[PDB]
Paper text:
Their activity is regulated via chemical modifications of the four rRNA species: 25S, 18S, 5.8S, and 5S.
We found that, although most of the ESs are intrinsically flexible, an approximately 138-nucleotide ES27L adopts two defined conformations related by approximately 90°. The yeast counterpart has been shown to act as an RNA scaffold that recruits the N-terminal processing enzyme MetAP, which controls the accuracy of ribosome decoding in translation fidelity (Fujii et al., 2018). Because enzymatic activities adapt to light fluctuations in plants (Martinez-Seidel et al., 2021), the defined conformations of ES27L are likely to serve a regulatory role. Using the mass spectrometry approach, we identified 71 post-transcriptional modifications and mapped them onto the structure. Overall, 216 modifications could be assigned, 71 of which are plant specific, meaning that they are not found in other organisms. Among all the assigned modifications, 89 are strongly supported by the cryo-EM density map. The plant and human ribosome have a similar number of species-specific rRNA modifications in each of the ribosomal subunits. However, the two subunits differ markedly in the spatial distribution of their species-specific modifications.
Residue numbers in the entry:
A (entry chain g): 2 to 128
B (entry chain V): 111 to 164
C (entry chain S): 2 to 125
D (entry chain H): 3 to 48, 55 to 160, 181 to 229
E (entry chain F): 306 to 311, 317 to 361, 365 to 403
F (entry chain I): 50 to 242
Amino acid sequence: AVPLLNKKVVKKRVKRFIRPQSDRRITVKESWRRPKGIDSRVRRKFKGCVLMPNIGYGSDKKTRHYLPNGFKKFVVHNASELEILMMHNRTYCAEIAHNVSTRKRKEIVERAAQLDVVITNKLARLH
Amino acid sequence: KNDQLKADAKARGEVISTKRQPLGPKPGFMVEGATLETVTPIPYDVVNDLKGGY
Amino acid sequence: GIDLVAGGKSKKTKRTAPKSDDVYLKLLVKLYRFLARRTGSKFNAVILKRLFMSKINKPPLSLSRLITYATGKGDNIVVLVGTVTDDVRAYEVPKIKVCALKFTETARARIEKAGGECLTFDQL
Amino acid sequence: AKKTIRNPELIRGVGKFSRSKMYHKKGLWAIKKKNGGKLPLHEKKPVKPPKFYPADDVKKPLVNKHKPKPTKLRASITPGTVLIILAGRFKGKRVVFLKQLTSGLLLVTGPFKLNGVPLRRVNQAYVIGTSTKVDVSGVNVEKIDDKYFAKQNVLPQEKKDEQKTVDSALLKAIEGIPELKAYLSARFSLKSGMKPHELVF
Amino acid sequence: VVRPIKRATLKKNPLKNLNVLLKLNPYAKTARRMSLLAEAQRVKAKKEKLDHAITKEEASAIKGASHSWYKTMISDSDYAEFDNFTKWLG
Amino acid sequence: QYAKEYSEQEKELIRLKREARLKGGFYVDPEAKLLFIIRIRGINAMPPQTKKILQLLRLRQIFNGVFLKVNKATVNMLHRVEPYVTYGYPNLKSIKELIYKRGYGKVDKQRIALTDNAVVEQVLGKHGIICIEDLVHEIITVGPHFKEANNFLWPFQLKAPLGGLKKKRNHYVEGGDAGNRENFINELIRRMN
RNA sequence: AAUUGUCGGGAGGGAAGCGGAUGGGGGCCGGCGAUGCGCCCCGGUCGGUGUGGAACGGCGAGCCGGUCCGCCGAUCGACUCGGGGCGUGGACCAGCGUGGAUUGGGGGGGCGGCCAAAGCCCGGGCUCUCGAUACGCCCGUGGAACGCCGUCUCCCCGAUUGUGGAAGGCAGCGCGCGCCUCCGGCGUGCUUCGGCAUCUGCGCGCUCCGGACGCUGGCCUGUGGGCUCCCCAUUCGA
RNA sequence: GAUGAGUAGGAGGGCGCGGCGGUCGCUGCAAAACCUUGGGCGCGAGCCUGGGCGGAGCGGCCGUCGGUGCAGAUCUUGGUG
Ligand SMILES: [K+]
Ligand SMILES: [K+]
Ligand SMILES: [K+]
Ligand SMILES: [K+]
Ligand SMILES: [K+]
Ligand SMILES: [K+]
Ligand SMILES: [K+]
Ligand SMILES: [K+]
Ligand SMILES: [Mg+2]
Ligand SMILES: [Mg+2]
Ligand SMILES: [Mg+2]
Ligand SMILES: [Mg+2]
Ligand SMILES: [Mg+2]
Ligand SMILES: [Mg+2]
Ligand SMILES: [Mg+2]
Ligand SMILES: [Mg+2]
Ligand SMILES: [Mg+2]
Ligand SMILES: [Mg+2]
Ligand SMILES: [Mg+2]
Ligand SMILES: [Mg+2]
Ligand SMILES: [Mg+2]
Ligand SMILES: [Mg+2]
Ligand SMILES: [Mg+2]
Ligand SMILES: [Mg+2]
Ligand SMILES: [Mg+2]
Ligand SMILES: [Mg+2]
Ligand SMILES: [Mg+2]
Ligand SMILES: [Mg+2]
Ligand SMILES: [Mg+2]
Ligand SMILES: [Mg+2]
Ligand SMILES: [Mg+2]
Ligand SMILES: [Mg+2]
């Protein structure tokens, strides 16, 4: 399958937004939280501090949610759901759900080859 | 005055405006030459720094 | 920086669509979105806006008040973005063509008995 | 028919004569008489089934009206000019410029006998044109072109003979100028205190 | 009763792009041609060393009037009203 | 026709000045009818009066520029925002460059680049202005339809001056950059357009 | 999970951690990167106008259809069928060319203004000296070059960048549609006598013209490429 | 076409947890939970997936509901420097 997308993917930021002071404290997890403190230097945006996520970092709408291979991901749980991508094989690639058995993955992989549907994790748990 | 000016202009088919206008820039003109009086700064005198002098 | 208020953006709010989930109302909105765009008629634009409005902004019209405003205008079609109710205080109901979102059971019977017609906005 | 352009250009896109002047020169007045006092009117100049239908409509790029122009030749570079190669295996060697090919590249020769540089194509951006000129009037390279340097290792004997034929006519001209043979046999290099932006070539 | 069924142009600098300028001001071409031709004549005239628009009497009057005006421009005050500083002012 | 008129006016002024010189008198040049105003201070710490006046002049951003007709009403307004602006008398060259390079028309309250004469005609057509040259002529001569023609022009978004400013905090007379610089506004327009 | 031992990698001149930017060393990733397509004949395989049946349909009794089976005629076509010949070529990176937009820098030319520059040089008249061999004043439609300011215009170099994917549109021109000796010449109208959108329509083309195209090379299981992952170093920030 | 600061505060659109009414699925050819210097998506809350461990359950989507989201409270209980 030849991906239909042609515009290059431009990531405004590749680094993640780490919660302030999550390094210092184990109990403070890395998932982002907006600091609400009155004196918070991160909230007040002093230079040399952690950056906060804002809408300006929004990626181009034409290249949004596109994987590096040039397709968009759709999660499939069986052979029937794989057939939904027959007419979108140049736009959407399938990914077998994490909890599908190895026996049923063989059917999905075989069917995807017939339909020319890209499978992102086709080598999963076959050894 | 505005009513009569518009009435007079209406009969002759000439659209005009009766609005007032603020003072605009003056046009160019020639001024006849005359004797020129030279103005220069005055030398300072401390005695004159008071109404009527010291 | 730019010396504007709220970055030059509007701070006014108006209804751009009905708040209701009524499937029939949304079909009427689609119908009159097309009519307003492709005709430029002021009537269609007014009708489209009033279809968005809330219940209190679409008050009912009594049959008696409808008759008085329709006196001497038999040929014209009465249009109401709202409900038409029956009025026991009105005795003589002339034949009239009325379009409304909803007719009460008594109001519909009286209008139909008098030879009039009750229309919807799709028939209008 | 007309032998020369009617309207020479003072600058690119602006003619020397105005519309009123051009009407006289175009002869439209004469044409009008011959056609009953009217300018003649002409008329405008008057499959296999697919084997596969794509699911996504194909998109064709919009029309671009800009057309590439031939590569320009630096004013410093003239036939017979000595060039200094700035890059590649022959960096620093002094060669003789013969002509510019259709592709825009420069055709140069060592000559091969003096410095071992054969008939080769060198990009204009990687050479410096000096002020030394060697006569190449007797050199014939009309047979050489872009296709002569196209791939399809032992060098065929045919090209070796071709090099000598072109080289031979050039050696006599080089030998005429004293010390020119040694000049072409030595590579250019920068020594201490030598500033490229101040050097005269 | 329906009415018949119904991208931004990249702005270019007319001060540099000739065709863009002619699209807005067609007369710009005539002005350009005349300026180029006028300059060419002047350049040619200077090389050939090619050789008045005022009457001889008028020229004399002009020189006198300008010379008289210049005298007033450089004229100085007599500094007579400063009686207390006559010596200092010289 | 406009090109011929501009040259005639320039030569007409020269002739009159020479004529006055010959007779020994003076020729007072006509007072400037057109001004170009540029905002040189930012939008921080604005007193209420200055803030309102700059809005009426459509100078809401530093280095924005607009034309302004000369009359006692407008001049007195401009006198009250002197330290926040610099202005002067634009020549024909300045008006051409501004309209041609940075000219945008206000069509239905939208900023539209003057790429074609159709844009000018869409708004100013009823006033007889159908091309950019007509728009230039109306501005330079301050014609009867100056108000509509000038308002049609979106305030010019000029760049920071190439070469910088001397001192925005002092008046141009003191060696600064604020206030009336008369014909020297053209020198600044070159470096900011 | 806090916390601890051990093995392995790494760092450490009075904290460490953290933001941003690269680099070194690791680890990881083949949808990390293609190998097809078009046209030929050799063979193989599989189906083909007009009339018969089977089960149905679109439009609204009647017209208009396809699918499947069979029979004739017609004799071609198809083939993720196997070989051969010819043409063509994918991902990423880099270079170059020709241009558009934005922008900085450099060089030259024309014209205008001024005391219709001043001055200087030439010619003429006057004045006649202490810094001693002057100081300067006035004249000429004399002459050769500047200066400042304004404006018109030509050329050269570098930097960043290609967003859009429906339109050969808009604008300005060229060549034909009439002849000549062809850097130009030949007809009306207007003219400042230089010129002029006054005649300047059609057809086919060109271009600074409704947003970048083209060419070449490198590399493609490698010590390669990429990386948002890991450790660490360094400059700035903190 | 214009435009982008925000404490207290207001509002919108979304993410996540556990049930219920439905609907579409997964699982001893290995569910949940947990672990990972595997990889990717989203501005972000989060989401998807490789490998490992584990050995019996689980998830998506629509609607609806709630004892539904923690770094602090000399917070509670337990554990540990
Ligand atoms: K350990
Ligand atoms: K100049
Ligand atoms: K470029
Ligand atoms: K490669
Ligand atoms: K650092
Ligand atoms: K369920
Ligand atoms: K994981
Ligand atoms: K739920
Ligand atoms: Mg991200
Ligand atoms: Mg505070
Ligand atoms: Mg798993
Ligand atoms: Mg802003
Ligand atoms: Mg605000
Ligand atoms: Mg301040
Ligand atoms: Mg702006
Ligand atoms: Mg600079
Ligand atoms: Mg400063
Ligand atoms: Mg201050
Ligand atoms: Mg632990
Ligand atoms: Mg001059
Ligand atoms: Mg593009
Ligand atoms: Mg905000
Ligand atoms: Mg759940
Ligand atoms: Mg870990
Ligand atoms: Mg979920
Ligand atoms: Mg509960
Ligand atoms: Mg609770
Ligand atoms: Mg806690
Ligand atoms: Mg808290
Ligand atoms: Mg505690
Ligand atoms: Mg405790
Ligand atoms: Mg303890």
